[PDB]
Design a protein around this ligand. Structure first.
Ligand SMILES: [Mg+2]
Ligand SMILES: [Mg+2]
Ligand SMILES: [Mg+2]
Ligand SMILES: [Mg+2]
Ligand SMILES: [Mg+2]
Ligand SMILES: [Mg+2]
Ligand SMILES: [Mg+2]
Ligand SMILES: [Mg+2]
Ligand SMILES: [Mg+2]
Ligand SMILES: [Mg+2]
Ligand SMILES: [Mg+2]
Ligand SMILES: [Mg+2]
Ligand SMILES: [Mg+2]
Ligand SMILES: [Mg+2]
Lengths: 314, 314, 314, 314, 314
């Protein structure tokens, strides 16, 4: 896929368009009114290059934009702030989660964006812009980021939800469903949970590090805003920790459950054994080729003497 | 529910009413005598919105009062100090804990509050101002906050008291009651203890950060008072950690109990089968179609060669 | 119980008595020769109240002396240093430890103590004053504290010694005595260790904080003395963490020992069954109602094709 | 093996050769153009001895170059910098990893290297120089180090990829392949990870030390280059953790898949027993020597009373 | 035992002798040429007392050298530097490790030592002095210290080596030797590892603390030396952890290997049981007392309908 979307807006108005030409966005560098140049489809490296070059982005900072397998970070430069993030997509049921990586380059009045596939969680932001809702138009571009970012971080809540409600189910399946591939299901969660954890802890650190310093900040306007996002990014990485703490000691339940049922089966076998082994032994004697109720009575009394004795076991 | 209580008190005198009108409590802003404007029922967004606009509160902070799914935190501002706390209910028997979110805003001589349902642990703190008991009237309106806060933390101790006695019992249940749902009951405790853990450790931080700084403090009057509640907050978060440390290694005690019971049955089975196998074999042989006490003697001896050989196993 | 002992002493002299009157001790506030006012029995809150009120002790601080369920701490004030400490009693056999809380208040030339029950580990110290042994009399009253403390921390060694020698035994019980109430006897330990380890880790911190600061110290006379009690305090809390780590991987030994014994039983069943199923089957067909050493030969022969085959398994 | 290979180059041009002679490289100490003196074969302690003494290197450092069983480290000196590193080789299938130590000495315009065997992951670096690709020729000799180092670190990624893929398979081996030597295949991995873990966490520290300090650096040319390696270095020593954390809880699946299967076996064995045990006993009673379908029906009716009762277990 | 040894040496010469007299060593105090007054046999408390007093040592400091049950530490004083350490003796095979305590006091030109039994790991040090090997004579008496310590620390490598190889074996013993007291052999390993890990971590800090400060150091002569001991000291403390991480999750393996084998046994027992229970039932029916190849055919066919059905289990 490949599609470039821009949303230049001022305090008063805006336009939007989805051109697939490269050059038709460059002039916006000098635009003194907040623009949002979203470059969906990063597979075309020729485009990032040209843009990179124009805006005065470093060559390595570009490369990072291209290399998806990277830990989220926040780089501070002389001209532009560069952040990378990774939003997720849990395939509910098909227990497995997938990870697109989005890169953000803030410069003057331009929030430059780089997605690798169409679709995101930024719909809410563009439209609040679209039909002027909330305080987005009123404020500058450095805010705009701290809107996109708010948007991304929000998404993780959804997942958590999904996961809580996953846990809730995959808890029940140990307690009272000792079956086969519950086990495998469990281990798919921890896996999922670890994988996640080390993408929030570093993302947490981004909004952590984006808080301490900040050059184009508009101090008491954009800052105390994203404190309330940094705050989110905490809870996220707090919650996770909770999950990875309950999930951790779950398999153990399963085992207790199972090694407890094994007790039951074993027990019945033993009890059946213990009465008809001897009773079939007596009657074995009396197939020897070398009072009929006398033997049955004694048998039938022994088969009691047992079932009694088995009231310390039941 | 919705019921707005107010306790304006000076060094000599106080009143107390229950009006459901939003307006009839605003003029206490400039009342220079310690007020306590309790707002029960945070479902009514319109009333917080009004009182928040009037007291000068930030918009994002109000949002947080309304959003119950948030960690405990304390926010220091130019005019007011904002605090977010959680108080718990443990339903004994039905092993499960429930959580309501109290928020507090101290501004001049107004300890402004926000509960989401009727009923709370602040009964004694309002009663101690009622029949003038202790030093609550005598001291200012920022002290009032550190009377409520003490009440909320003092409740937590009750929860620990319920849980200790719980564990007490639910431990016996592993040692001397190896049954079925003991398993799940225990996992319900860890669950509950993690859930807790993540709600004191932050609350503990509240009273820890509420220590280091503080602008309306009255240094050596109210600060060395809550040092005593920040202390309480520690102990809590230490006790919780003791529990989650004893509860942790409990399933392994059950497992053991049961992977030992397995053995017993497993054992008895084998002695039975081990003896009445061959005896039911010898007495099998002698059902062939192709000294009676010779065979019985030789049977009745082997079954003793076995019993004695089985004094390495008993 | 109630019994207030005192021991004032100078470089030259001392007395000792066991009055049970409250005021007969108050005049020792201004005594410029080291005085040790022991208040055994904290149940008489009135007694505490008076003394406290007299010596100028803060109200909350008095509460702490009466409230036994607290983490050991060292409070620094303008006039007096206030410590809270706990000392234990391990009932050998009945595997269960008990806790009494000692509170200490150092002021000018008064070390003001608070025990709840008669009988302590302070018997050597008063004796060392009694029969002027060592450098006690010689030195001041702040040193006196660091002679009680030492004695408190030195008892803990006794405990560790007990528990070492308790572990040792309860370790053998796993390896070479895989029985029943080993399991519970073990959990009792981790229980007792956690309990403990959350009482030293804090007590450590007291001597750690009593090191970094200190107003009545006599720098190079008392400070480098209790370095070598803060030293001990580290060791104890180092030793405890040793125990809580060995013990930690203990139950897991048991399970393996049992899950291995099960194997033996399981295995012996199978050899038995695996021969005397078919030999009773053979001998089962030859009871059919529709060369005697020919069948005994082929029976006896398979009964070795078996035992031979079972020389991969033994 | 033994084969010393050098690469002196300037902004304009370069040469390469592979002399076995020790002396034909020493004159490059004063070659003002960047020289790369690769010494493959550190077994010849004489060759090392010589080149060391000439370059004014300390003795102890040399030893380290000859000692392979050492943690990677960086040692800063007045004249030169010294680094020790280790690269790895994973034998797929034969689950085991082998470790050659590489050591580096930067001085003026001399990157001095020490391989213990022929073959390395530096093929590209020499190649990029060879066909003047990228910015290698252009920049100084201190930059050259931070090209070797990169290629080495980059190697590690390949390992991680190998293992990820390994994990992915050996994970399926517990889920859906509960066999025998998966057990040992698992541990091995833990074994191999730790071994790794503890060679990255220090190698990570090297590039962490190499970043804070640095005397020959060319500040804003080389220093911000290797940050992006330092970076890598983080990611790796992060990812490792991921793995180590997943694998950790893996054997607990297997165990669970096992204790579950035994249960099936245990069950089958029980129900065959629980029905034919009695039926044969009846048909035992009627082999006594002291309406035919009467018995068969009562048998066959019983055999149904079982199978139905055993619809609670299937 | 008891045998005081001394080795005063200078840039040029030395003597050695093994007096049993306490005084014959005192005069060295003032010797301006490095002396090493090794006092083996600390059971004679009278000796230590005397010399302690003569050198000007503190009384508590002496006690420490007389109390062997103590953590390694580095006390810095006005005149002297005091250090305590421990050296070990792993009884190979008799899986258990023994711990003697060495005590060191550096003062001017007097490295004063305190062993409790004959034999140690300082042999190499004394002789490098004996037959002027290396830079031991050349340098001062401080340096002497950082030669002994080098020697002691160098012993730990032996231990590790002895343990690394112990693990290698006591690992196999799980995979491929599921016997009995292998179990206990691995708990003895953990046991031993923790015992160890609690005396390096502190021995590590001592060379950490000996690094940060140091008064008689000879800055760029003896300091940079022991940097390469502290170094060693870290690796030691590093590898130990590696071990106490492999050995940790080993018992697990053994569990999985035996809960696997319990599966086979269980299995076999089952198949044998699941054919000859009904076949012996058939032939049970035909021992009733109320086409010979007809029954044999139908029995035999079943006994293949089975064997085929059990191609899902093998
Ligand atoms: Mg990059
Ligand atoms: Mg939001
Ligand atoms: Mg939930
Ligand atoms: Mg918020
Ligand atoms: Mg209270
Ligand atoms: Mg088991
Ligand atoms: Mg208190
Ligand atoms: Mg002592
Ligand atoms: Mg000491
Ligand atoms: Mg376990
Ligand atoms: Mg070295
Ligand atoms: Mg690269
Ligand atoms: Mg018959
Ligand atoms: Mg050496």
């Amino acid at each position: 896929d490949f599609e470039i979307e821009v949303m230049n807006y001022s305090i008063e108005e805006f336009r939007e368009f989805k051109t697939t030409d490269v050059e038709s966005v460059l002039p916006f560098r000098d635009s003194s009114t907040p623009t949002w140049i979203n470059i969906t489809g990063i597979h075309r490296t020729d485009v990032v290059q040209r843009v990179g070059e124009f805006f005065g982005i470093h060559p390595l900072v570009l490369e990072d934009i291209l290399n998806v397998h990277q830990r989220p970070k926040v780089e501070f430069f002389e001209n532009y702030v560069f952040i990378v993030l990774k939003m997720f997509t849990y395939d509910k049921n098909l227990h497995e989660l997938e990870s697109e990586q989005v890169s953000l380059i803030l410069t003057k009045n331009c929030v430059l964006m780089f997605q690798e596939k169409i679709g995101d969680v930024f719909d809410p932001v563009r439209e609040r812009i679209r039909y002027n809702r909330g305080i987005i138009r009123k404020k500058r571009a450095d805010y705009l980021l701290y809107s996109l970012i708010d948007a991304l971080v929000d998404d993780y809540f959804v997942l958590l939800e999904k996961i809580d409600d996953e846990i809730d189910v995959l808890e029940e399946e140990v307690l009272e469903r000792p079956e086969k591939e519950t086990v495998q299901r469990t281990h798919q969660l921890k896996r999922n949970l670890v994988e996640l954890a080390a993408t929030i802890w570093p993302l947490r650190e981004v909004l952590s590090s984006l808080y301490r310093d900040v050059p184009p900040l508009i101090e008491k306007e954009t800052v105390p805003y994203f404190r309330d996002v940094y705050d989110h990014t905490i809870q996220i990485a707090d919650t996770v920790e909770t999950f990875r703490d309950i999930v951790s000691g779950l398999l153990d339940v399963y085992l207790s459950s199972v090694s407890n049922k094994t007790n039951e089966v074993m027990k019945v076998l033993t009890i059946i054994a213990t009465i008809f082994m001897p009773l079939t032994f007596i009657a074995g004697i009396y197939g020897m080729n070398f009072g009929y109720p006398v033997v049955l009575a004694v048998m039938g009394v022994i088969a009691v003497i047992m079932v009694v004795y088995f009231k310390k076991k039941k």
